[model samples]
Target chain A: NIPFTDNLLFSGQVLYGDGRLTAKNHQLVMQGDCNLVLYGGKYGWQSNTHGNGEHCFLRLNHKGELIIKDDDFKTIWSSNSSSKQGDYVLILRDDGFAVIYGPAIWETSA
Target chain B: LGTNYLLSGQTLNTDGHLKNGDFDLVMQNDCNLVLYNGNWQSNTANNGRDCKLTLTDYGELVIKNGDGSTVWRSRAKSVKGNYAAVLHPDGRLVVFGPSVFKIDPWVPG
Candidate 1:
């Protein structure tokens, strides 16, 4: 709820703990364990950063990377879809993808 | 999610399962990608390391490496709506796309 004022998350925005983006039946949830998971029915694609530490969040940083990081600012995982381009919006698309929506680089299933 | 099928580009990692009723498909840590029917298995074990099972955009089942190279794959196809690799209700793994009818490799019903 925090990272997004609307349905879209702009660059440098962050979310954690049930903070999410929803579109249609699909959602991107920042779970209690701190994993950034994209859920649709029985499928959930994860950034797999769970069990690392507390105060973690999913961030669409200024560097065009959608990342999960701990309290210490340690990146646990990132969407390899990073470009030198810039900060992009993280949008949960109806097609079941949490997209870094600004360029042709979309998600690669995680 | 996708019910009986996995969308193209969606990956199943080690021990990941895509379930439909009694059928389950898994990618083993030992690098085998298996499909299970109740108790029977597809027997694709010991295939390689930290492997991934993906339903390709073109509707093929690809076992891939960390570098994104192909370890193994099924025959491919596609659709404008995109395709999915499915573990059908009859317990067969097949690709459904763009009216490319597949003849049974075993025997017909």
Candidate 2:
């Protein structure tokens, strides 16, 4: 898996396969079934935000929003999360939570 | 301009790391510079030996054992300028300078 350091998402970038973000025992993955879930052991913190949405991708844009989009660049779901422009990093924590660390802007319902 | 890097001769000790959450670039006591969670390794040629990985100013990413002998490299040489190694979420461990230069894999040399 990979981590979203640097906190910048160029247009057209995506997270999938081994490109997921993880922490202690938690993980955020884009599923083969076209779903995105945050896992805390066997429990799902955030489950199937987008049902059967194919070729989906997750991006952290220049405006500091965390979004999920279809392969055609159409918005499917979003964290509705935003932070001050230069101070955000999306992190999955040991506490079974996936959150945007800067400004504490967004989080999964762990 | 980014956060993933190691300059020439920089040593990342066993407990030391360049990380973004659980995804980490660690220098294990086993002497391997590993991009962890992805299990991307720099060298398995000589384990348990003291090795350190560096980003040469000349734009080479090398693995040096305790005696400072080069054992592995990204194999891309002398494409100069300030450089940093980035671990892309796409599972690419790359070294970039004025332009994209080296794409290193989990195993090298």
Candidate 3:
């Protein structure tokens, strides 16, 4: 998830995250054999690097959305995949659940 | 050797013989998989190609290229050991071989 207009302001968004697994400016695409985990970092988001603890494969966009593409560059996942973004917090629970939390309507369907 | 041949990370190329002993090979991880006897044969490797092998929380061995593209895998292969042991027999071993046999796409419960 790239900061739409301000990286500094939005970059800190991940720090105050209320989810178990919260990342900013990132997207995750799980290919058949590879699991791409990316996050927003100064150098670059982590993708496909295992145990790195700071990255995923998806990159951020200027629209504040995390664009996740496949090996062929096809869009498979997206941070904007839903309409619950304003108060949403990305969470990958220990029970293999990927959820998007919000103030009033949290999404936990993955 | 008790059919317990080893892929030593010691030497360079020459495939080591199965001598009776516990073995250890460097595999270098992204470098080379050589025998411990200390020998290198010409044109044995695919030009130091760096590949990544990962085992997810789930028991699976996946092989990916340097660019993070998966080339081969042992997705459904049995892996009771802590680490996937790399060995040599001469015909050549590759992750996700071309002619790998398959089972049902979905495992039965």
Candidate 4:
């Protein structure tokens, strides 16, 4: 349910772990352990940056950067995805793939 | 906070709207889900006033507005199930029940 025009963050007005974003069977969650994972049942695509990293947070900016950061707001991981040509939207397709679309610039391997 | 739909007993008051920062999706009295951004951003075009949008117990998503006029509807007519129309953050308004009705917002081609 991450809107095409949404970004996840740990600080500022929008914070990480605020709630869950869903799309049919697929979902994006910031675990209690601060791990950001896209899940579709037992199968999942994770940020892979977790554990004691409770201070870490992730964000999907309008610029098309799905970024993960530490409590201090330092970059940790990133989707490195973008839709430079036109406006694109991020969606968790019903089939269980988390994708940035309009043109589908990127997605999780799940 | 990603979805903004009018369910049974749910009303989108003139001032009350679902907000994502400065963006808002408000169900106007005209039965239209209007997206506002200090100006017209988009809408459902479900025009009417004093009307109410509801997901009936039988699962019919109806927009009963404008002096008893029906301005909008979902495919759930006469069906039975839990129904809801969500204002996805992608800016598209959609209804989910026995089927999916993409009511408004222009997706780029």
Question: Which candidate leads the pack in lDDT?
Answer: 1
lDDT of 4 by residue, B25-71 (tens): 66575456555653443345545567555556454455566466656
Model 2: how far residue A47 lies from native, Å: 42
Among these predicted structures, which one has the highest DockQ? 4
Instruction: Put down candidate 1 lDDT per residue, A37-92, tens digits, no spaces.
Output: 76663456666677877878887765556778888988777775554454245545
Tens digits of per-residue lDDT for model 4 on A1-110?
A: 34333321211212366345575565677665667777664456666667746566655555445666778877767777654443233444444545442221111111
Of the candidates numbered 3 and 4, which has the greater TM-score value? 4
lDDT of 1: 0.58
Worst 10 residues of 1 chain B by lDDT: B98-107
Give one digit per residue, the lDDT tens place, for model 3 in A7-79.
1112123221111132243322332332443232223222343332222234333233444444465654455
Pairs that clash in candidate 4: A8-A59, A8-A60, B4-B87, B30-B48, B51-B65
Better of 2 and 4 by lDDT: 2
Ranking by DockQ: 4, 2, 1, 3
Steric overlap count per candidate:
2, 0, 22, 5
Q: Per-candidate DockQ versus the true complex?
A: 0.02, 0.04, 0.01, 0.05
Q: Output candidate 1 Cα RMSD.
A: 17.8
Candidate 2 lDDT score at position A31: 62
Between prediction 1 and prediction 3, the one with superior DockQ is 1
